Design a protein around this ligand. Structure first.
Ligand code: MG
Lengths: 48, 215, 45, 202, 84, 67, 50, 242, 49, 209
């Protein structure tokens, strides 16, 4: 499927830093992951 | 040490644009490219919808009798409006639509100091019995301003005055018949269309001059 | 092929053929309480 | 509150939200407003700390400069569970913690809640700066091995630094001192792990 | 503990305010209400003590009431903030 | 610069009587009984009392004679 | 453990704090990531199982 | 065929095949609005069908919470990487950007319920009255003449919801209290103020107010405002189907 | 009488976030868009694990 | 718009060749940006003078041992990399050494050449060499164009900076930038970083005002 979208089949690519501006030495893994949010808000946990 | 006196600006679309700087040194070709990226993303003048007032609903969690989408979804569609202001910074817009149809960005009464870039943005879908009348208030800001830092029937929106989306830059060797070390800086800019790309570099260069002069 | 599937289609990598569809996920609660009510009125309850 | 890792914190200090430091040190703020001469009546000083004016934040950072606070998890099995720290005013609703002292607390950043305590008397302030300080209990109470040993993430960064490659960029070069060898790495003419020849001063 | 300390500072400021004002305006209210600790007296009971003219001793009560009100506003304490 | 209560505890090598001499020393500075010999570091009284132990300006017999 | 019994304690806290700064600064510049190609499979696995 | 769709209700027209002899096109789907759930979380339904689209048995007309076109959508997705970034992700911690909070992706809606009851004390029985003593002019502007805050106001900590008077007796005014009541000028009030307020650290917006009156009691000015708006919605919904 | 209050709680540092494979987590710092690692095209990442 | 820019700076001095400066009030998107721009300029683009080539008599290779000197031949090249010499008359000049303790002040110098370090030692006796010094821009290796040695034209030795939090009651979220600089004794770190802001402002001066 990565070959059809003109993407590297290894799934890794070298990313450029935003603060220093230098390219990383080793390639990193990027993608899209489905994240969730749990009912553990800090408004009901912080007390003093 | 040669400095570019004229900046070349190329326009490929209404939003995307490329900026090239040929006469630059090799040591400063990579430093000026990374310095202009962080400034063009954090602090940039822009305009967006801040406060909206609808006479039909009392709060934002309510609904309107005769509309297809909820009020919260209407407040989310108004955030993607690209409004360009030439004169004053505070201007109030009015909206009125009755009957079946699709309320677009061109339905708002235009003025001399306002100019909406895109008119294909869908706000809400009305019905035969649906009729809405609201007033839009915008402001000129710099960065992210939530509703906490900013009667009945008023709605406060989380306005984001950042007109930039994606900024990138590359380094390419550009010969000037002097040495092979001189390289050019090709910087591409993608904005919302509310500002011109020829003035974005002049704004970032002015901010960097004030910080370095006080050093 | 219903109407709700005409808007979004999901590609599946299942290679085994389906023989029995997934039954009602709440069948252990609806049929268990239906015998407690016994709304059917016949000669032999 | 909920813990939060902070890499920009010193070992002898920790983090503390502004909303918690204003409630825990409430009697200490009333002592500085009356001694300075801003509010003679304790009732007038109470209305000033609730409105959170710009003057209250000036005396709040002044009363909290070297007054150590206590931090401890809910389950405590050894003496290293209670370690005194120096609070630093931060912005948020979470209590920041040093990444190196997490091995002693036996707590991970997965939703763990730690307690807080405030000493009052002068005898307790000198106790938290001599024995219960974070810089004093370095060695473990079981064996002489330190418990502040670099953790998983920082060791991984140090293991990649101390490596040797057969073929790398900038091999065989000779450097004068450690300051001259670091200058060549930031310029891009020398790799991170390459066989070189440097002169040291030990 | 914070409410008990507030009643201490408030009570100590009342005895201090009654002493910093005039000596004549302070003894006419200390015998009427009993703020200094003496026995409380009515308008007729306090008449045979200082002044038999019940109308004259009432005019100075309003003058001392306004002086205690003005000395409280400039002291950094608000009357609306006291009741809350 | 800052107070060093780690090296100061190694001079007396007690770590239990050091806080006893520091308690009576820090109490005299808060009440105003004696002026500290070392200049004020814009800190609390509990910090200056610990630096005077390592410097050697105060002792058990010195703090007793000041009262 | 060797630094604690040679120099002392005043220099150990500074040495233990400076290791966290140089450890994190040189780790963010590295692209250490776990990919599917990292879990290599030896060719001798099919010979032993068969 | 969907005859008319709205954000509040969805009306569909039944075909002549799968219908009885009389009252064929009689189907009213009333979508529920934001109600207080058991875990204090908002629950709403949004339409996803347009006018003129034919549906069949078992089709999805509107989705509930955490549902997108019939598919379960618990959370959201975004671009993720795998690299230790300045030790911020030490053991389990997650580092986030500014676009995740600027686009309002994880912004949730909480619904809290606050109730008040009028007891029957042995001293004196009194009902809910808006006029309360020892109050400032800031609460009068927000509180209505009946004793219920308007729907849509920004109620915060320290704001009163309803007005409830409590009779008292044997005040035993101390001499320190007699001096305070003289410097104010106002008369003495024995009725205390025990009205319901918002707890410290809670801020929200009123979206709905429900009242309950026992049998035989007289209806106040609040019980007639909501009851009239409910029957008018049922009448307009019945006349539309008619 | 029963009054309802609507609170719009926004995500803040200290919140608990997790995935679908049993990977709990607590957000530490909401860093700006310039510090996040980006690709050559200029698409920065949002979550770093 | 208007940003938070301090009009006064504070310089803390520790040694004659080591200083430490800081900038307390700075915006969130400007604390680490100025530190990264000043570090790349002071280490890649800086006018200076340093030795480039050397021609020792009787030494065929850099690893071939010599007689009469206690130190090795590789130790002599490592000591020449730390010399500080300023050139003001000519771009490229040749310095000849002739002595048979070798002190850098014993080298025959002209009027146009300037040497600051007179107490520096080159080698120890138990010497016929030609030194070549020129101007450059940054750190130039010997591979990319004892004949070739690593020439370090940048007078700055080491630059380090860390972004720490600040305390301001108005915004309550800012940062400060502290800079650490080292010099070779030719120029003070106060004027060394002042020239870096002049060259940085020399690029975008004609682009926008
Ligand atoms: Mg845990």
């Amino acid at each position: 499927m990565l070959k059809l979208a003109d993407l590297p089949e290894s799934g890794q690519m070298r990313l450029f830093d935003g603060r220093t501006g230098n390219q990383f030495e080793r390639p990193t893994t990027v993608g899209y992951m489905y994240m969730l949010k749990l009912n553990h808000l800090v408004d009901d946990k912080m007390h003093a | 040490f040669l400095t570019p006196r004229h900046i070349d600006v190329q326009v490929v679309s209404q939003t995307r644009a490329k900026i090239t700087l040929e006469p630059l040194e090799r040591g400063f070709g990579h430093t000026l490219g990374n310095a202009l990226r962080r400034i063009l993303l954090s602090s940039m003048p822009g305009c967006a919808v801040v406060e909206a007032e609808i006479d039909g609903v009392l709060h934002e969690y309510s609904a309107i009798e005769g509309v297809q989408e909820d009020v919260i979804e209407i407040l989310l569609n108004l955030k993607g409006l690209a409004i360009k202001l030439h004169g004053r910074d505070e201007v109030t817009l009015t909206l009125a639509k009755k009957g079946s149809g699709v309320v677009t960005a061109a339905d708002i009464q235009l003025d001399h100091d306002v100019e909406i870039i895109n008119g294909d943005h869908v706000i809400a879908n009305l019905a035969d019995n649906g009729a809405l009348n609201m007033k839009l208030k915008v402001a000129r800001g710099r960065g992210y301003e939530p509703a906490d830092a900013r009667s009945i029937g008023r709605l406060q929106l989380d306005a984001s005055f950042s007109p930039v989306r994606r900024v990138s830059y590359v380094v390419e060797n550009a010969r000037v018949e002097q040495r092979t070390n001189l390289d050019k800086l090709v910087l591409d800019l993608e904005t919302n269309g509310t500002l011109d790309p020829e003035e974005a570099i002049r704004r970032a260069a002015t901010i960097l001059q004030q910080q370095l002069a006080a050093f | 092929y219903s109407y709700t599937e005409k808007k979004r289609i999901r590609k599946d990598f299942s290679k085994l053929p389906d023989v029995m569809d997934v039954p009602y996920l709440l069948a252990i609660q609806l049929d268990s309480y239906r015998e407690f009510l016994q709304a059917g009125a016949t000669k032999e309850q | 509150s909920v813990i939060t890792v902070g890499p920009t914190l010193r070992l002898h200090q920790c983090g503390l939200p502004k909303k918690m430091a204003l409630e825990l040190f409430k009697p200490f703020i009333f002592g500085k407003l009356e001694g300075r001469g801003m509010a003679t009546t304790i009732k007038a000083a109470k209305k000033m700390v609730e409105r959170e004016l710009p003057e209250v934040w000036d005396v709040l950072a002044e009363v909290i400069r070297e007054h150590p606070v206590l931090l401890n998890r809910a389950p405590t099995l050894h003496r290293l569970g209670i370690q005194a720290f120096e609070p630093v005013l931060i912005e948020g609703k979470a209590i920041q913690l040093h990444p190196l002292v997490c091995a002693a607390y036996n707590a991970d950043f997965d939703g763990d809640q730690m307690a807080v305590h405030v000493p009052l008397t002068l005898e307790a302030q000198l106790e938290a700066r001599a024995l219960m300080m974070s810089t004093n209990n370095i060695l473990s109470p079981a064996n002489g091995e330190p418990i502040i040993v670099p953790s998983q993430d920082v060791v991984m960064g140090l293991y990649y630094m101390t490596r040797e490659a057969i073929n790398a960029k900038g091999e065989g070069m000779a450097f004068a001192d450690l300051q001259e060898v670091d200058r060549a790495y930031r310029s891009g003419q020398a790799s991170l792990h390459a066989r070189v020849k440097v002169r040291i001063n030990e | 503990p914070c409410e008990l300390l507030q009643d201490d500072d408030l009570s100590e400021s009342i005895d201090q305010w009654l002493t910093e004002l005039t000596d004549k305006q302070r003894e006419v209210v200390i015998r009427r209400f009993g703020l200094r600790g003496h026995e409380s007296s009515t308008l007729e009971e306090v008449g045979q003590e200082i002044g038999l003219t019940r109308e004259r001793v009432r005019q100075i009560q309003v003058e001392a009431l306004k002086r205690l009100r003005e000395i409280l506003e400039k002291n950094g304490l608000s009357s609306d903030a006291l009741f809350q | 610069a800052r107070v060093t209560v780690e090296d100061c505890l190694d001079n007396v090598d007690n770590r239990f009587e050091l806080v006893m001499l520091a308690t009576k020393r820090a109490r005299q500075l808060a009440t105003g009984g004696k002026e500290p010999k070392v200049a004020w570091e814009n800190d609390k009284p509990t910090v200056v009392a610990l630096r005077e132990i390592a410097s050697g300006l105060v002792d058990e017999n010195v703090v007793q004679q000041e009262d | 453990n060797h630094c604690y019994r040679v120099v002392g304690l005043k220099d150990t806290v500074i040495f233990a704090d400076q290791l966290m700064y140089t450890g994190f600064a040189y780790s963010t510049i590295s692209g250490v990531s776990i990919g599917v190609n990292d879990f290599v499979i030896p060719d001798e696995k099919a010979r032993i199982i068969n | 065929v969907i005859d008319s769709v709205d954000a509040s209700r969805v009306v569909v027209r039944v075909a002549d095949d799968e219908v009885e002899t009389g009252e064929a096109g009689v189907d009213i789907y009333n979508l529920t609005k934001y109600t207080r759930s058991n875990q204090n979380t908002c629950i709403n339904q949004r339409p996803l069908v347009s006018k003129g689209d034919v549906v069949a048995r078992g089709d999805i007309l509107a989705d509930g919470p955490s549902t997108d076109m019939g598919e379960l959508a618990l959370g959201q997705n975004m671009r993720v990487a795998f690299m230790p970034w300045n030790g911020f992700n030490f053991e389990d911690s997650i580092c986030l950007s500014e676009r995740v909070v600027q686009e309002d992706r994880f912004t949730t809606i909480h619904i809290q319920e606050l109730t008040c009851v009028a007891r029957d004390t042995k001293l004196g029985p009194e009902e809910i009255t808006a006029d309360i003593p020892n109050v400032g002019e800031a609460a009068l502007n927000k509180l209505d003449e009946a004793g219920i805050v308007y729907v849509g106001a920004e109620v915060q900590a320290g704001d009163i919801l309803v007005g409830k008077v409590t009779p008292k007796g044997e005040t035993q005014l101390t001499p320190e209290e007699k001096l305070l009541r003289a410097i104010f000028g106002e008369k003495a009030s024995d009725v205390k103020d025990t009205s319901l307020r918002v707890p410290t650290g809670t801020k929200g917006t009123v979206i709905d107010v429900q009242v309950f009156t026992r049998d035989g009691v007289e209806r106040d000015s609040r019980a007639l405002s909501i009851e009239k708006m409910q029957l008018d919605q049922i009448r307009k919904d019945l006349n539309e189907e008619f | 009488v029963k009054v309802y209050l609507a609170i719009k709680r926004r995500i803040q540092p200290g919140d608990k976030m997790a995935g679908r494979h049993g990977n709990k987590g607590v957000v530490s710092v909401i860093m700006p868009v310039e510090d996040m690692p980006h690709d050559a095209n200029g698409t920065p990442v949002d979550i770093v694990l």
